[PDB]
Amino acid sequence: EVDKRREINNEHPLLMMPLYANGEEFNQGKYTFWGGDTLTGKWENIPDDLKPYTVIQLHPDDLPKRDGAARDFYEHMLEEAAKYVNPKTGKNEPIPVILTVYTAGNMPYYTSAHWLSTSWIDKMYQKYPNLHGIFSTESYWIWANDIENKAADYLKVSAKNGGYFIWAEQNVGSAIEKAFGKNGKIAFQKSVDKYWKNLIFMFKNTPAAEGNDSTTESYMKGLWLSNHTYQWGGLMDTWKWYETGKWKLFASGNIGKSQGDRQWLTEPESMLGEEALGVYLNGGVVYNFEHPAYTYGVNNKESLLFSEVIKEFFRYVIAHPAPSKEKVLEDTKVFIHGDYSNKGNGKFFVNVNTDREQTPLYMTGRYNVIPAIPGVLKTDKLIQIKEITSPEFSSTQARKEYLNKLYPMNYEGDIFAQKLDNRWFVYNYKVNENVKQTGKLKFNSLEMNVEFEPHTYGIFERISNGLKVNLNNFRTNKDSLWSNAQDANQAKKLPQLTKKGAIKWIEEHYIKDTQFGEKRVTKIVLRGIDKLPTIHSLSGTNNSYDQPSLNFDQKNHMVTITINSNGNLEFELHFLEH
Numbered sequence: 001e002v003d004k005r006r007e008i009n010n011e012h013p014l015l016m017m018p019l020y021a022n023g024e025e026f027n028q029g030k031y032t033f034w035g036g037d038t039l040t041g042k043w044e045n046i047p048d049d050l051k052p053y054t055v056i057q058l059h060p061d062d063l064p065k066r067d068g069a070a071r072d073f074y075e076h077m078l079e080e081a082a083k084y085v086n087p088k089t090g091k092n093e094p095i096p097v098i099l100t101v102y103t104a105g106n107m108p109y110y111t112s113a114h115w116l117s118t119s120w121i122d123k124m125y126q127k128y129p130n131l132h133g134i135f136s137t138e139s140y141w142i143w144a145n146d147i148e149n150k151a152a153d154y155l156k157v158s159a160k161n162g163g164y165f166i167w168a169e170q171n172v173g174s175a176i177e178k179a180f181g182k183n184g185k186i187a188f189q190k191s192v193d194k195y196w197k198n199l200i201f202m203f204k205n206t207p208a209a210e211g212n213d214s215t216t217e218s219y220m221k222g223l224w225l226s227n228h229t230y231q232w233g234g235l236m237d238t239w240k241w242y243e244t245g246k247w248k249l250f251a252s253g254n255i256g257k258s259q260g261d262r263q264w265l266t267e268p269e270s271m272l273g274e275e276a277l278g279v280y281l282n283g284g285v286v287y288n289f290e291h292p293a294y295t296y297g298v299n300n301k302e303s304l305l306f307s308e309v310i311k312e313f314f315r316y317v318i319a320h321p322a323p324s325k326e327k328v329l330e331d332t333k334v335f336i337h338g339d340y341s342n343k344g345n346g347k348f349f350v351n352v353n354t355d356r357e358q359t360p361l362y363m364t365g366r367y368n369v370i371p372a373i374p375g376v377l378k379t380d381k382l383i384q385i386k387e388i389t390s391p392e393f394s395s396t397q398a399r400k401e402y403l404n405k406l407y408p409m410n411y412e413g414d415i416f417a418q419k420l421d422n423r424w425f426v427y428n429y430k431v432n433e434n435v436k437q438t439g440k441l442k443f444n445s446l447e448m449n450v451e452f453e454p455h456t457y458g459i460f461e462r463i464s465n466g467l468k469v470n471l472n473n474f475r476t477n478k479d480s481l482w483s484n485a486q487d488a489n490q491a492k493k494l495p496q497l498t499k500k501g502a503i504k505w506i507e508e509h510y511i512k513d514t515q516f517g518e519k520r521v522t523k524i525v526l527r528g529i530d531k532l533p534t535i536h537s538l539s540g541t542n543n544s545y546d547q548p549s550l551n552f553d554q555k556n557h558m559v560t561i562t563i564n565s566n567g568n569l570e571f572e573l574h575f576l577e578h
């Protein structure tokens with residue numbers, strides 16, 4: 001094996017930092033990105049603690065669809081990245097880069113990436129030590145006749161140079177199954193047999209109306225556990241709100257795919273953290289997001305979604321490495337072999353661990369994510385390994401009856417919760433319904449009851465001297481975007497915000513003059529404690545929380561903690577048990 005250019009694993013996770021080429025400005029002789037970020041400026045603005053775990057991902061977006069455009073733009077930016085000088089130290093510190101090399105089947109009518117040869121990619125790897133990988137994203141809807149062959153070549157050229165091939169794809173139209181040879185195109189299967197240590201496979205949750213979130217994530221996890229990918233992760237996309245026809249938060253009615261640039265701004269910020277937990281809690285280590293203007297920011301400035309949710313989440317997964325492959329393997333009780341495409345796709349998990357067909361969330365952590373690999377792959381080398389065609393998986397009820405025998409019930413209440421070591425992870429799983437959820441969790445004899453509004457997650461760690469709490473319910477008010485529409489009919493008919501309009505809205509009304517959401521209440525009740533706990537190390541989003549209220553009831557050895565907040569929040573409670 002050629003020495004790897006970087007590590008990507010639980011201890012060295014990866015946050016991809018997208019920069020999308022501005023093709024309109026390219027036609028005017030400029031080298032710029034949509035949203036006004038610059039390569040150097042974006043890198044400089046990444047906190048120094050995150051720099052070792054963050055890589056700039058260039059994307060060719062709307063560069064002209066002709067030979068040379070993407071090479072020109074990419075060479076220009078690789079040069080900028082290579083020559084970067086840290087102004088504090090005066091040292092040349094080449095900026096790490098991933099290039100988007102394949103998208104939309106690389107059709108010449110869809111992308112400038114068509115004209116990026118494997119020869120050119122090899123040349124770039126050899127010229128730029130700071131080129132750490134190449135990225136393929138979103139071809140499920142245009143499954144080119146040579147897509148598997150090209151993916152093999154991308155993986156091989158990456159392995160040859162110590163780089164990673166990273167593929168973000170969703171199991172629409174059997175995409176993941178076909179990638180590994182379902183329909184007889186086996187070149188990528190064979191490449192992975194050799195070069196899996198240089199592959200990263202990610203979900204891409206954009207096509208939310210097709211409901212393949214749970215099954216794609218199941219495959220990413222199973223491919224990883226079975227050594228068909230070095231690591232896995234996910235690209236979580238606020239465009240899901242567009243794809244599913246939602247509009248104003250909690251409003252009635254569906255507007256369809258009619259207001260895209262308003263719609264990709266509307267997903268609650270903290271919901272991205274809820275999605276990301278599904279990656280982390282299942283051993284995934286690679287994270288990416290769209291739309292970049294909302295999820296990361298503009299003009300080399302962090303959006304509040306980035307600063308209050310994504311940045312803090314990513315810091316958490318660096319501080320608490322995700323469960324290792326070995327650990328996840330030990331914990332896996334059932335591993336599915338076969339094609340979700342033959343068993344209802346995402347419907348497979350509805351009312352097993354998802355609450356509806358179109359959601360990126362889970363309603364229980366009891367089974368965590370059940371890992372699977374497509375039927376084309378083998379289970380010889382790879383726990384009960386079960387064919388997807390088994391009677392145990394024939395119906396919703398059968399699945400639960402079987403899984404429940406192997407995965408015991410470990411909490412109470414209609415809420416998402418999952419436990420790792422001494423940590424309960426909890427979130428309200430409602431997507432667009434304004435409904436509180438409650439759960440009862442235990443740390444041995446200590447009882448913790450929680451009440452969460454939608455778009456709220458928490459991490460509760462039993463430490464020797466009490467409990468460490470991380471809470472995030474950050475959700476700004478997007479109603480301005482939907483003003484002048486009292487119903488779905490009117491909302492569908494609003495003037496288009498447009499891409500440029502949405503970027504400008506972020507600049508003028510999100511980066512500044514933000515319409516923050518209202519503070520809202522979280523309740524935490526601890527039963528079985530000796531004395532009034534003390535609170536320590538309280539911090540969170542500025543101006544976003546009231547001082548927590550602790551009400552201790554001596555007779556019943558319990559405390560009720562009431563929090564009123566809208567943001568990220570951390571604190572410790574110190575106490576002993578009774």
Ligand SMILES: CC(=O)N[C@H]1[C@@H](O[C@H]2[C@@H](O)[C@@H](CO)O[C@@H](O)[C@@H]2O[C@@H]2O[C@@H](C)[C@@H](O)[C@@H](O)[C@@H]2O)O[C@H](CO)[C@H](O)[C@@H]1O
Pocket residue numbers: 020034059061062103104137138206239240242243290291292499
């Ligand atoms: C047409 C358009 O608005 N393009 C911008 C938009 O692109 C994404 C959306 O159109 C989304 C709707 O669900 O569909 C996605 O396919 C699309 O993603 C882009 O194209 C695909 C083929 C891939 O190349 C993706 O990597 C790419 O983002 O939003 C993105 C930013 O999220 C860009 O501004 C597009 O210009």
